Structures are given as C-alpha cells and as structure tokens.
Amino acid sequence: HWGYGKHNGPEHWHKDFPIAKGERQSPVDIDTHTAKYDPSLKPLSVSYDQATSLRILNNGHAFNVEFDDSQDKAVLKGGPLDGTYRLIQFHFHWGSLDGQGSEHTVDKKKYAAELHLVHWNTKYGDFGKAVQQPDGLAVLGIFLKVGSAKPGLQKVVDVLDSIKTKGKSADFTNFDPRGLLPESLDYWTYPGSLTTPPLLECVTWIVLKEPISVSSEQVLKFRKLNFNGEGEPEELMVDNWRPAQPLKNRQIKASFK
C-alpha cells in the first residue's frame, strides 16, 4: 500500500522499508561542480540493436515497457560497469507540472520527467537474484524536458489509452529503445538504490547529462494515466517521483570534463 499520496508517499515508506533511511539511497541531487571527472571511466556501450520488447504494463506506480531478457539481446556494458547488464524494462517518473517530475536533480534543477532503463547483471542469473547484490542492477537515467516532440516516444504515448488503469497490459512488440536516447552518452555515476519500495541498495546509477526533449502533448498523455484500477475512484498518475535523498558517504563521478 505504499504510493505517492499524502498518506502513503515517500515520507511514510521507511515504516515498511527501513532501508529508506540507508547509506546509499536514490535519487540524489547531482552537484555538478562537486562531481569529479574520472578519466579512467572506460567507454560506455549501449547495445540495443537486437532488443525484443514484449509488453507494456500499468503497475499502479508507473508503466513498464518490458523486454525479453532470457538472452543477451539488449545490453549495457562499459562505463563504471564490470560485466554485462541485460535490459529488462524501462519506465518513467513524471510530474503534474512541467517544473517537476524527475527523481534526480542537477544543481537542484528538476526536469519534467525521467526515463529509467533498468538492467541486471548477468552474473546473477535472474533479476530477482540481482536485486539482492550490491552490483546487481545498472539503471540508465535520462532527463526529459518539454519542448520539441520526441518522435521515438510517440509509439509509447499512443498505447497509453489501452493501459489507463492499474493492472492493464498490452502487447508492445518491435519497439526500439534507441529512439529514446540523446546524442551524447556523457554521464554521471554513483552507487545507489531502487527509487521505489523495496528501495534495495543494488543499483549502479548512470545518469546522462544531456536531456531529451518531449512535447507538451506527449507529457500530457502521461498525466492521463491512472494510479487506480478500473472501477475504482480516479486518481491521476502524476508526481510519481521520490525526492532527492542524502548523499552520505558517496562521491558522484563524471565521465566528462
């Protein structure tokens, strides 16, 4: 029964998930002047040419575009990572207003939304095992700002009417997640956590510096989704973001000068 409401939102999560007050929680504010360039961060490798999307699901928190992760079809390697991380799903966090919605912030700036491409370390065999490990997941985070449309997002936008309410799914094959990437792969990285319960401290975060732009109409369609199930009181799926958490004993590294 966690969520994003007044009575069950981020300030309440610690009562069921005490790791919410842990040593490596996410998201964080990225202080760009304090991040340090790490010249040894070896090139990042996004290999999504053989990606196989399967389905899109409204899980009551967000919507997930799910991939076949039973082979190395869409993988992330390089950068801070040791080994191979398979893409399992992507989702977004977004606001009720264009001035909020991202989970990470950059010098305290919120973006309108944030895309999370979730990958698990193949050495752990399955996603469920990976989330129990400190290096189990790699999440590629991409900021969204409102401006020009993102053509490669439109197929996602257009299916949302079919998954309005919690528990709905729709087949979603042949979607190419390369159409959601910015031009540059410059990034910041730090060790953190899942940003929703169970808040497990299993993530290497890789947050791209360059935001993608989406149109006002595209984000407006995100905001028509519902947190509730069909036949329950309508509650718009907006402001499904956790605010920045204390950095504690962490350094954020930059791939770029």
Could you identify the residue written with the tokens 């979603």? 172
Nearer CB in complex with Zn ion: 38/127: 127
DSSP character string of 98-109: TT---SSEETTB
Does 2 contact ligand A1H15 by CB under 6 A? yes
Nearest to 182 by CA among 142, 138, 128: 142
Has 61 been annotated as catalytic? yes
- Using CA atoms, how far apart are residues 37 and 34, in angstroms rounded to an integer? 10
Q: State yes or no: residue 6 binds ligand A1H15 (CB under 6 A).
A: no
Region binding ligand A1H15 by CB under 6 A among candidate stretches 13-21, 48-56, 180-188, 223-231: 13-21
Q: Which amino acid is at 100?
A: Q
The single residue among 16, 23, 107, 232 that binds ligand A1H15, judged by CB under 6 A, is: 16
- State the Cα–Cα distance between residues 146 and 167, nearest whole angstrom: 28
**Three-state SS for 169?**
strand
Amino acid at 250: R
Total residues binding ligand A1H15 (CB under 6 A):
16
Q: How far is the CB of 231 from Zn ion (least distance, A)?
A: 27
Q: With CB under 6 A as the contact rule, which of the stretches 2-10, 142-150, 175-183, 209-217 interacts with ligand A1H15?
A: 2-10
Select the residue interacting with ligand A1H15 from 195, 218, 226, 240 (CB under 6 A): 195
Active site residue: 7, 61, 104, 119, which one?
Answer: 61
Specify the DSSP element, H or E, that contains 119: strand 113-121
Amino acid at 65: V
122 among the known binding-site residues? no
Q: Whole-number minimum distance, CB 174 to Zn ion, in Å?
A: 24
Q: Is 116 in the site for ligand A1H15 (CB under 6 A)?
A: yes
Q: How far apart are CA 248 and CA 211, in angstroms?
A: 26
Do 127 and 121 meet the contact criterion of CB atoms below 8 Å apart?
no
Site for ligand A1H15 contains 257 (CB under 6 A): no
Binding residue for Zn ion, selected from 24, 77, 110, 116, defined by CB under 5 A? 116
From the list 6, 15, 108, 257, which residue makes contact with ligand A1H15 (rule: CB under 6 A)?
15
Q: Are 46 and 162 in contact (CB under 8 A)?
A: no
d(CA 88, CA 78): 18
Q: Which among 53-61, 112-120, 226-234, 249-257 is the span making contact with Zn ion, rule CB under 5 A? A: 112-120
**Among residues 115, 139, 142, 238, the one that binds ligand A1H15 under rule CB under 6 A:** 139
- Spell out the residues 6+ positions from residue 61 whose beta carbon is closer than 8 angstroms to its own: 3, 4, 196, 227, 240
Cα(21)–Cα(99) distance, integer angstroms: 26
As annotated, the binding site for Zn(2+) includes 91, 93, 116
By the criterion CB under 6 A, which residues form the site for ligand A1H15?
1-2, 7-8, 12-13, 15-16, 116, 118, 131, 139, 194-196, 198
Instruction: List residues with catalytic annotation.
Output: 61
Binding footprint of Zn ion on the chain (CB under 5 A)? 116
